[PDB]
Amino acid sequence: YLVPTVIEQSERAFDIYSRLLKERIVFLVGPVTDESANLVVAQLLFLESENPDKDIFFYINSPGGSVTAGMSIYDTMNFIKPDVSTLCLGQAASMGAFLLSAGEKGKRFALPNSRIMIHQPLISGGLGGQASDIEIHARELLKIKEKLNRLMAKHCDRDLADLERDTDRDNFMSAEEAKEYGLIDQILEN
Amino acid sequence: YLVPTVIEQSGERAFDIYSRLLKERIVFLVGPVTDESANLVVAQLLFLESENPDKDIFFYINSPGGSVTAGMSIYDTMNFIKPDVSTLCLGQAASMGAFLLSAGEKGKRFALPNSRIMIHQPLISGGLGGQASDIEIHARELLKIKEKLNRLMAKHCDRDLADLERDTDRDNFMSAEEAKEYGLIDQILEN
């Protein structure tokens, strides 16, 4: 894709995403990979240094992705001093919904027709080799499953038992249902 | 991916965001460890030593592993250069990623609270085809690498070689707390 170039008056020419980063807007678009997550981490670290007090706006339009990649974003969001506000555009599914709920409490938003989906993790990696190797990877996946449900329950002010029920299979929610659930705080209109 | 451009105030200088973070001695190892990705880390470590041999270098690791020889080029560069190389685990440090994480300066090895650290014996460092004489040679070389890695890991962790031989037999996944208790990292960052 051709990323448009915009001019900032101060003149400085930016691509439109660097221009929005100047306004403390970080985009997570598409699958969460090592490379896309590290760009988010790099932007979060950079924005904290520019101003540790001003809010960072984390715009999420993602179907999910790697858990470890999403956890690098998650720990960076919680570590850095400035509040990270999260906004759901289009969809926040799987780790995208996790990072959406991971925003600062009171500053988690979704657009009115966005779709938010939460579910237990799939394969974090293949389970081949010997039964001893498969047992190890199964145990690690169960630990990740419990860790995700526990952190989700903390984000949503719900019991761990509620998240274990609701993440068993793909749980699709409107913006209103996610607000009632505890994934987001407000729904934006204008 | 489109790498964002940021402006440094000094006049102004436009950086991509990774060159901007390198300006403050942050080196990223993201994804698999290859000859090319490891040599970029080595080039950055060498460059940062020249800029300031006394200031710490921050080595951010989010890697599932990779080549042993490639990781050893980073490892020897970390130990050679004068400035301390602090290591931080983001997301995951597995295989050679966990090795390079434990290779950080003692007291300055960090991990984020939900990071995952995995240590294990090496797999194929290369195929074992050809004749039985060739296969014997490559098997012996892999065993020497296996012992070298366990020995260096045991040194990093202040543990016995026998402990690392047990624990690296199969994929050993550890939380940040378990890696701190093991000796792979020194501290867990929160805020």
Binding site: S49, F79 | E24, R25, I26, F58, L88, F110, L189
Partner: protein, 340 residues
């Protein structure tokens, strides 16, 4: 005899609230200067430089009060000059010799006393150097005044009109100069020298704390502001004034002889209405004034806008005897409790 630093500061506390380090610095420097003059055995190789004083601080911090209190106590030829009136000798305005003339007039033109007096110069940050001029014929009000002032601060002899309408030669080797001003660009100069910051997890990241910034001023920072280096080198003592905190602002609000509270109580004493402030009201007034960043001057604005809806009605309200200003009147849009 010679009032000692303990005596000097003990009487500066009667007029200046807070700024303890500056009162100590001024008292020690003045006592050392006068003792040094009384015992000129320092004619030996030791070149004890004339310990002039530079008095930097925010607006409303008490520079002009420290000067006046130091003046009226020391019982010495003391003049208060304003660099806003100073000009180059060959142009309209007051040349730097008018200050020596005022110093003589303050001592009945007995030059023996004037040559051992003090010269206070306010707003010295207003004659700083600047680039070549818009308003270009000569930068008269700027560097020219600095050089003519430097020629006085260092040991020289000035020629001034007689006592009546025959010029008097006045040697300023032993005249102490105390310069002051609110250097508004100094915090940016210092914040460029430092405030490096950093990025990353293991790096420290971070309104300007002009208090600690002024507390770490260096001569080169003042050179960048526009002062000539030879003048700063002649001003070795640098007294810094902190921003008045809530407690100091409260004391200023109530304790001094001409405090705002007493001023308005007497302003209502022209009527027959008693004015009473609550402790929380004084606390909130001090907080709001500190938030305005104008020093003790931002205290009058608060007390004036909180009593505006009352002074407008006092002559119309009959039977009123007391008015009580509470914390709600200051923090909220409330009316003081009227007691009829």
């Amino acid at each position: 005899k010679l009032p000692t630093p303990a005596e000097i500061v003990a009487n500066l506390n009667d007029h200046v609230i807070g700024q303890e380090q500056a009162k100590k610095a001024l008292a020690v420097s003045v006592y050392n200067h006068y003792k040094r003059l009384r015992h000129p055995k320092a004619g030996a190789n030791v070149e004890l430089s004339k310990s002039n004083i530079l008095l930097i601080g925010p607006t409303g911090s008490g520079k002009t009060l420290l000067a006046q209190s130091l003046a009226r106590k020391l019982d010495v030829p003391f003049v208060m000059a304003d660099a806003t009136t100073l000009t180059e000798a060959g142009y309209v305005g007051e040349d730097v010799e008018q200050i020596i003339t005022k110093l003589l007039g303050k001592c009945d033109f007995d030059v023996e006393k004037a040559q051992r007096g003090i010269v206070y110069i306010d707003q010295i940050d207003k004659i700083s150097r600047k680039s070549d001029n818009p308003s270009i014929t000569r930068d008269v009000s700027g560097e020219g005044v600095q050089q003519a002032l430097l020629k006085l601060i260092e040991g020289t002899v000035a020629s001034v009109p007689p006592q009546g309408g025959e010029f008097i030669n006045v040697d300023t080797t032993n005249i102490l100069f105390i310069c002051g001003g609110a250097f508004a660009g100094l915090e940016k100069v210092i914040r460029q020298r430092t405030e490096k910051g950093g990025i990353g997890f293991g790096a420290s990241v971070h309104n300007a704390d002009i208090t600690k910034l002024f507390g770490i001023v260096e001569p080169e920072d003042l050179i960048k502001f526009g002062l000539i280096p030879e003048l700063i080198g002649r001003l070795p003592v640098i007294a810094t004034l902190e921003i008045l905190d809530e407690d100091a602002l409260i004391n200023i609000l109530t304790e001094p002889k001409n405090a705002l509270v007493k001023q308005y109580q007497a302003l209502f004493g022209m009527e027959n209405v008693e004015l009473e402030f609550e402790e929380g009201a004084l606390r909130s007034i001090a907080r709001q004034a500190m938030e305005r960043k104008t020093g003790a001057r931002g205290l009058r604005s608060i007390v004036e806008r909180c009593l505006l809806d009352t002074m407008y009605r006092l002559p119309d309200l009959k039977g009123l005897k007391k008015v009580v200003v509470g914390k709600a009147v200051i923090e909220e849009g409330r009316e003081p409790e009227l007691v009829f």
